[PDB]
Structure 1
Amino acid sequence: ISPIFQGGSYQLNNKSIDISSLLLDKLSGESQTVVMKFKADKPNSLQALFGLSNSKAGFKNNYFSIFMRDSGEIGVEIRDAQKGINYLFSRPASLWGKHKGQAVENTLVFVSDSKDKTYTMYVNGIEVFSETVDTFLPISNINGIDKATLGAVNREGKEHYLAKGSIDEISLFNKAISDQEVSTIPLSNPFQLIFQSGDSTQANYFRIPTLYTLSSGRVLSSIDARYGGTHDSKSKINIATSYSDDNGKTWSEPIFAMKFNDYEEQLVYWPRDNKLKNSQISGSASFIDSSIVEDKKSGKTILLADVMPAGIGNNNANKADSGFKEINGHYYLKLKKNGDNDFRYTVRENGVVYNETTNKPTNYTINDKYEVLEGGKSLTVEQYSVDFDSGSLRERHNGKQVPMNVFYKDSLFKVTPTNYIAMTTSQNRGESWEQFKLLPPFLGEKHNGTYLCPGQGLALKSSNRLIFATYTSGELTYLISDDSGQTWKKSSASIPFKNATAEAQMVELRDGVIRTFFRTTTGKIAYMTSRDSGETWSKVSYIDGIQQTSYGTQVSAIKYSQLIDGKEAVILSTPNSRSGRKGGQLVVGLVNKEDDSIDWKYHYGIDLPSYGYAYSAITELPNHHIGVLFEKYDSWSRNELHLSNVVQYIDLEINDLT
């Protein structure tokens, strides 16, 4: 239908614009839709874009507003003191500020639906909240409304929440427009989604993006598909992948690289309230933190990720056990049978389950999918599903049988509850993935596994060497393969931090010379250098000119193929903030050929200093553009948990950065 009111080109310069005479007499009925196209690249801390209020003395709390914060949060207030109603609905990290030196036109759609008693907000084609209430308050039914305002709310005759920005277009409808109609509204998005709520993964949340450009020109991406909100393991998380054959313009429907089936793939809206937001799926196995590399010789794509048994995460993982038993310089996966209090079994040659106590083979075997067979017959367990129907998180059997896996809660034979690393490969550049296999332990029988550094592995340009960085307490542990990932050895590099999440990414500065950039506990990104293809490593130095928080954030890094200002270039991606995960930047460093030192010469701001930017992936696209897939929110903040569609993709050119 046609709008009851439509206006545009409104400049909000800390001075409200009164549109009462244009709009108030046109409002009718209990349902309304507001469509607003707006810019704000220099917002005040808290500002109202649109207001309907009772501006009379004594009615200060009778108003409707659409507001935003300089954090990028968007929301509404719907308040009527006589009715005793004070609704506040909002979501952090819903907005764009600037892209390539230009203010971004955000397209906001707010639907106030009396029939279903629901208020729904979309921004840039993404639903950011949908709130159903017992007692509906139509925005036009607030007692004594006498003002309609842009760029403030008029309360007791004064301008509150003054805004800096512009409203290019605003439209109001006396109808709650349908989900279908919303989808038809044109958008001006600076970003794309590769993974998103409702896609083939059926995860409502995603974290830990990766990107890697393959030799064919295909660009591949992996990610954590996180089902139980955005929580780290313990949870249900799978690793998903998608690729682009057109320089990032379009992306394939995701598939899984690594997945477990003990719990259903459920699209769930995770509670964001203070009582329930820490609810965590507690009985599911999961994968977490993937990394990809391409092997030139075999042409294989290799993907590693951490593997967590049912109910296990970093916090509760057995720190003094690898999960393997060494027997004659060979490692065997240990198993515990239900009823036993110790691990009396190992998985020997050909998947045979062997009793270590009696030194006899059993009638059980483990297949290549880590599934349990008895006398050759596949055992099953019942799958779990999760719900909040009862007011709290419940995990319960759903009637479906799935193969019994040694990583599952219900399995007859269980692995040691600690963290592992697994590897899978693809022989068709991400169209399908093989069954994963566990890597061996690298730091001995009685040390838990190291943690994979998410992002890219490194394929040395002048040899067949492949390297994946990992970390543990007190060191980076580089995993090195010269045979297409068939066998691995470690190279340890001590770092002067205990208990750091030392996520590290590598660039080959020149043949045989690797620089590794990594997260620390000091507020500065660190680096170390190898001049022998990763055999040995320098002491740790720090990058001046970029700030991180004390807890740090993953940093991505590539070696750019083209000269910049006549020099070899490295590009880093990281938040640049001592305060939070925000102020995302790409930082261009020029290498000095004399001493391999790097002049960090250009800093490109991804969006506002105050807008969220966390884990990130960068790659040089085949056309020499840069693709960036990143968490556009503060993935540390306890206020920004469980947001959907915030991992986003953009395309940049070197000219944009410099």
Structure 2
Amino acid sequence: ISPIFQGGSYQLNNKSIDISSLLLDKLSGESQTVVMKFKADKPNSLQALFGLSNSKAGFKNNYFSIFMRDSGEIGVEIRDAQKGINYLFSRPASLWGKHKGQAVENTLVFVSDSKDKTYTMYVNGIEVFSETVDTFLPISNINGIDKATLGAVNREGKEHYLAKGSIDEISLFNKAISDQEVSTIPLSNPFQLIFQSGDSTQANYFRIPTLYTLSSGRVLSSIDARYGGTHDSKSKINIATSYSDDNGKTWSEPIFAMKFNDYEEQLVYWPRDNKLKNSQISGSASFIDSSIVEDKKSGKTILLADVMPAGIGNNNANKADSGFKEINGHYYLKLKKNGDNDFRYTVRENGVVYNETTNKPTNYTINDKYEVLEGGKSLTVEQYSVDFDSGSLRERHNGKQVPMNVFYKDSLFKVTPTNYIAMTTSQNRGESWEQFKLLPPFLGEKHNGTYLCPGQGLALKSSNRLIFATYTSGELTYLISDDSGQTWKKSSASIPFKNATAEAQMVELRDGVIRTFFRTTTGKIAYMTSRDSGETWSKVSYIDGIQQTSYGTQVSAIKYSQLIDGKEAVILSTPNSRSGRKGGQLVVGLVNKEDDSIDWKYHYDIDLPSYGYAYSAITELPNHHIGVLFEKYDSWSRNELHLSNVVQYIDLEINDLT
């Protein structure tokens, strides 16, 4: 299983390199594998790394190419005019540019398999596309191929798609190497994966990463395990967690912190074509947006997430209703029975379902898992599975029964179609999680619930106080517990925005002094300050020197434990761009002890300004390195939906940042 061609140390400086004499006559049979280790830290807008072409006049559309874009997209073209074949396969956000200042060696493996009629592309150990066709075109079998080229494609005698970069190593094989053999090829990745396609979650997609360093030194991560592509609810989403006991070097197989069972956990390849990419799992309950904190006193870890029932709806479901009924100073979860046109039930004390019209209790109770019991017996519903077998999304019963939950479409009793917040705890630092409990309404019976700010909660250094930031229209709403999360109270902090996705994260600058950085609609990150451990909040200011888009992106933030240039330091993680979710940065700010103002002194580029960077999580690791888990793609863009293995983890040292 040896190369028919092997070469390296090619410099692509806007001048193609001819390797036709070396390669062309070696090509034989209809299956080929290309292995290429390359750097491109200053790419042109659109460039080919490798071309096989008919360079003759009139045959400009007869070539094979491996190309990239300065957005980080990778692809191939496979074209033959006489055969009437014009294949283009690609995936956005497939590349690295730079890491710690140095050009990243990307490892690219392209397999053209005539027997399976399939083209498969791997970059950096990640499969980014695998495409089967009815009419297979061997790359070697393009009519009149007479040029093998590095760093351009020769069409009619001219250099198209000129590249800037380098190819440190390239090998070709007259065989389609197995997925197994692919996995044995050495990689030089700057990142690692915590959560990934095919792991225990069986989600093909992940979003909304979090990171938190526990007092034992265990580092914990939570994430949205997203099943129906990368869409926000409506979809099927569970909250998964993983932890590292060796400063981020390795990570446990994920488990669920919050899960529903109404729909099967399926690993699905979500269509990316314009006609089908907006298909959505539409009848599933789900979670979305998790946040983690650790309680010094009990030692427990606490995880909150938004919860959504299957009946949720983007506009008329359900602002102006909390889903609870106030009865004598207390709040009770409302319920609608199959058949009624209003919510004539509540879940009163010990989960007894009461009929509000008659105030009489019923023979139904709700257990700890929000499951329905009749006379003490567990009611069930049939699970759903999804498929695109018929050329469109279908959601159908799969024969399997699962406990009946009030969040489900098929349930006898349903909650209000609105967003809630749930809380779970772990007593073993993320080895297992309790059944979740809904938090009560904070803004009243008739206000819909606030939205959890994903990332971290705040454990104040000097007290037992726990704080989770949430948002709603017109304010941040901080949730405050002084009793290990048994009871919560709110602290409202008005902001000058209506319907902003005001995702907020907090740092403690010094004892009792909290600064909250948050997402806005102004193109600038905002902040407010509290000096009484979250009781009251200042007016809103904005950060200069960092740009976000009009719609903005989540910002992650930590207080670094060590002095930098002799001052207290805060590190922010955000895209730095007014155009899209790209140009990732860690920004180091130094605190001015005179006024608690922050001088944003150091900007570290995570990767190229044009390479994707969206939601993020940062934590100070126990060894004082910085851990970063982040969406490495544009999670807003309608062109970069449903990509696998783009949430990645890196390790950095402060010297890297400065």
**TM-score, normalised relative to structure 2:** 1.00
Deviation at 1:544, TM superposition (A): 0.1
The answer to whether the 8 A contact 1:425-1:434 is kept is yes
The answer to whether the 8 A contact 1:36-1:169 is kept is yes
SS at 2:180's partner residue?
Answer: helix
The change in CA–CA distance for 1:313 and 1:511 in structure 2 (over 3 A counts) is: farther
Deviation at 1:189, TM superposition (A): 0.2
In structure 2, C-alpha distance between the alignment counterparts of 1:331 and 1:66, rounded to whole Å: 61
Counterpart of 2:219 in structure 1 is 219
In structure 1, C-alpha distance between the alignment counterparts of 2:346 and 2:507, rounded to whole Å: 39
SS at 1:599's partner residue?
Answer: strand
CA-to-partner distance for each residue in 1:373-394, whole Å, 9 max, x for gaps?
A: 0010000000000000000000
The change in CA–CA distance for 1:311 and 1:642 in structure 2 (over 3 A counts) is: farther
CA-to-partner distance for each residue in 1:202-234, whole Å, 9 max, x for gaps?
A: 000000000000000000000000000000001
Deviation at 1:314, TM superposition (A): 4.7
In structure 1, C-alpha distance between the alignment counterparts of 2:421 and 2:558, rounded to whole Å: 24
In structure 1, C-alpha distance between the alignment counterparts of 2:316 and 2:460, rounded to whole Å: 36
The answer to whether the 8 A contact 1:213-1:622 is kept is yes
Deviation at 1:600, TM superposition (A): 0.1
Deviation at 1:641, TM superposition (A): 0.1
CA-to-partner distance for each residue in 1:554-580, whole Å, 9 max, x for gaps?
A: 000000000000000000000000000
CA-to-partner distance for each residue in 1:384-418, whole Å, 9 max, x for gaps?
A: 00000000000000000000000000000000000
In structure 2, C-alpha distance between the alignment counterparts of 1:555 and 1:117, rounded to whole Å: 44
In structure 2, C-alpha distance between the alignment counterparts of 1:15 and 1:319, rounded to whole Å: 59
SS at 1:326's partner residue?
Answer: strand
Counterpart of 2:244 in structure 1 is 244
In structure 2, C-alpha distance between the alignment counterparts of 1:2 and 1:472, rounded to whole Å: 61
The answer to whether the 8 A contact 1:235-1:311 is kept is no
In structure 1, C-alpha distance between the alignment counterparts of 2:313 and 2:50, rounded to whole Å: 44
The answer to whether the 8 A contact 1:99-1:606 is kept is yes
The answer to whether the 8 A contact 2:308-2:418 is kept is yes
SS at 1:598's partner residue?
Answer: strand
CA-to-partner distance for each residue in 1:277-323, whole Å, 9 max, x for gaps?
A: 00000000000000000000000000000000004255453001000
Deviation at 1:353, TM superposition (A): 0.4
SS at 1:22's partner residue?
Answer: helix
In structure 1, C-alpha distance between the alignment counterparts of 2:316 and 2:615, rounded to whole Å: 23
CA-to-partner distance for each residue in 1:33-88, whole Å, 9 max, x for gaps?
A: 00000000000000000000000000000000000000000000000011000000
In structure 2, C-alpha distance between the alignment counterparts of 1:335 and 1:462, rounded to whole Å: 42
The answer to whether the 8 A contact 1:13-1:165 is kept is yes
Aligned pairs for 1:212-611 (under 5 A) are 212-312=212-312, 314-611=314-611
The change in CA–CA distance for 1:419 and 1:480 in structure 2 (over 3 A counts) is: same
The answer to whether the 8 A contact 2:42-2:164 is kept is yes
In structure 1, C-alpha distance between the alignment counterparts of 2:258 and 2:139, rounded to whole Å: 47
In structure 2, C-alpha distance between the alignment counterparts of 1:572 and 1:311, rounded to whole Å: 37
In structure 2, C-alpha distance between the alignment counterparts of 1:476 and 1:618, rounded to whole Å: 21
Residue ranges of structure 2 left out of the alignment (5+ in a row): none
In structure 1, C-alpha distance between the alignment counterparts of 2:185 and 2:127, rounded to whole Å: 13
The answer to whether the 8 A contact 1:305-1:422 is kept is yes
Aligned pairs for 1:617-656 (under 5 A) are 617-656=617-656
SS at 1:50's partner residue?
Answer: strand
The answer to whether the 8 A contact 2:294-2:300 is kept is yes
SS at 2:187's partner residue?
Answer: coil
SS at 1:181's partner residue?
Answer: helix
Counterpart of 2:97 in structure 1 is 97
SS at 1:197's partner residue?
Answer: coil
CA-to-partner distance for each residue in 1:580-623, whole Å, 9 max, x for gaps?
A: 00000000000000000000000000000000000000000000
Deviation at 1:109, TM superposition (A): 0.2
SS at 1:25's partner residue?
Answer: helix
Q: Does 1:125 find its partner at 2:125?
A: yes
In structure 1, C-alpha distance between the alignment counterparts of 2:116 and 2:389, rounded to whole Å: 19
Deviation at 1:462, TM superposition (A): 0.4
In structure 1, C-alpha distance between the alignment counterparts of 2:437 and 2:476, rounded to whole Å: 22
In structure 1, C-alpha distance between the alignment counterparts of 2:101 and 2:614, rounded to whole Å: 21
In structure 1, C-alpha distance between the alignment counterparts of 2:275 and 2:315, rounded to whole Å: 21
In structure 1, C-alpha distance between the alignment counterparts of 2:312 and 2:88, rounded to whole Å: 36
In structure 2, C-alpha distance between the alignment counterparts of 1:380 and 1:91, rounded to whole Å: 41
The answer to whether the 8 A contact 1:353-1:362 is kept is yes
In structure 2, C-alpha distance between the alignment counterparts of 1:273 and 1:348, rounded to whole Å: 48
The answer to whether the 8 A contact 2:575-2:613 is kept is yes
The answer to whether the 8 A contact 1:313-1:419 is kept is no
CA-to-partner distance for each residue in 1:408-440, whole Å, 9 max, x for gaps?
A: 000000000000000000000000000000000
Deviation at 1:333, TM superposition (A): 0.2
The answer to whether the 8 A contact 2:312-2:318 is kept is no
In structure 2, C-alpha distance between the alignment counterparts of 1:35 and 1:315, rounded to whole Å: 49
CA-to-partner distance for each residue in 1:476-524, whole Å, 9 max, x for gaps?
A: 0000000000000000000001010000000000001000000000000
SS at 1:66's partner residue?
Answer: strand
The answer to whether the 8 A contact 2:5-2:173 is kept is yes
The answer to whether the 8 A contact 2:581-2:635 is kept is yes
The answer to whether the 8 A contact 1:234-1:311 is kept is no
Let me know the Cα RMSD of the aligned residues.
Answer: 0.5
CA-to-partner distance for each residue in 1:442-461, whole Å, 9 max, x for gaps?
A: 00011100000000000000
In structure 1, C-alpha distance between the alignment counterparts of 2:267 and 2:411, rounded to whole Å: 25
The answer to whether the 8 A contact 1:71-1:612 is kept is yes
The answer to whether the 8 A contact 1:290-1:452 is kept is yes
SS at 1:399's partner residue?
Answer: strand
CA-to-partner distance for each residue in 1:311-361, whole Å, 9 max, x for gaps?
A: 425545300100000001100000000000000000011110000001111
In structure 1, C-alpha distance between the alignment counterparts of 2:28 and 2:611, rounded to whole Å: 37
In structure 1, C-alpha distance between the alignment counterparts of 2:246 and 2:317, rounded to whole Å: 42
In structure 2, C-alpha distance between the alignment counterparts of 1:312 and 1:174, rounded to whole Å: 53
The answer to whether the 8 A contact 1:232-1:313 is kept is no
In structure 2, C-alpha distance between the alignment counterparts of 1:65 and 1:406, rounded to whole Å: 53
Give the number of aligned pairs.
658
In structure 2, C-alpha distance between the alignment counterparts of 1:273 and 1:474, rounded to whole Å: 37
The change in CA–CA distance for 1:507 and 1:313 in structure 2 (over 3 A counts) is: farther
Bigger CA drift: 413-422 or 312-321? 312-321
The change in CA–CA distance for 1:101 and 1:165 in structure 2 (over 3 A counts) is: same
Residue ranges of structure 1 left out of the alignment (5+ in a row): none
SS at 1:350's partner residue?
Answer: helix
The answer to whether the 8 A contact 2:469-2:477 is kept is yes
In structure 2, C-alpha distance between the alignment counterparts of 1:28 and 1:40, rounded to whole Å: 30
CA-to-partner distance for each residue in 1:628-652, whole Å, 9 max, x for gaps?
A: 0000000000000000000000000
The answer to whether the 8 A contact 2:235-2:281 is kept is yes
SS at 1:56's partner residue?
Answer: coil
Deviation at 1:99, TM superposition (A): 0.1
The change in CA–CA distance for 1:313 and 1:509 in structure 2 (over 3 A counts) is: farther
The answer to whether the 8 A contact 2:297-2:484 is kept is yes
In structure 2, C-alpha distance between the alignment counterparts of 1:377 and 1:511, rounded to whole Å: 51
SS at 1:141's partner residue?
Answer: coil
CA-to-partner distance for each residue in 1:172-215, whole Å, 9 max, x for gaps?
A: 00000000000000000000000000000000000000000000
CA-to-partner distance for each residue in 1:114-144, whole Å, 9 max, x for gaps?
A: 0000000000000000000000000011000
The answer to whether the 8 A contact 1:475-1:492 is kept is yes
The answer to whether the 8 A contact 2:120-2:130 is kept is yes
In structure 1, C-alpha distance between the alignment counterparts of 2:390 and 2:316, rounded to whole Å: 27
The answer to whether the 8 A contact 1:314-1:419 is kept is no
In structure 2, C-alpha distance between the alignment counterparts of 1:441 and 1:474, rounded to whole Å: 17
SS at 2:25's partner residue?
Answer: helix
The answer to whether the 8 A contact 1:582-1:613 is kept is yes
Percent of aligned positions that are identical: 100
The answer to whether the 8 A contact 1:582-1:612 is kept is yes
The answer to whether the 8 A contact 2:387-2:395 is kept is yes
SS at 1:532's partner residue?
Answer: coil
Counterpart of 1:45 in structure 2 is 45
The answer to whether the 8 A contact 1:293-1:457 is kept is yes
The answer to whether the 8 A contact 2:199-2:253 is kept is yes
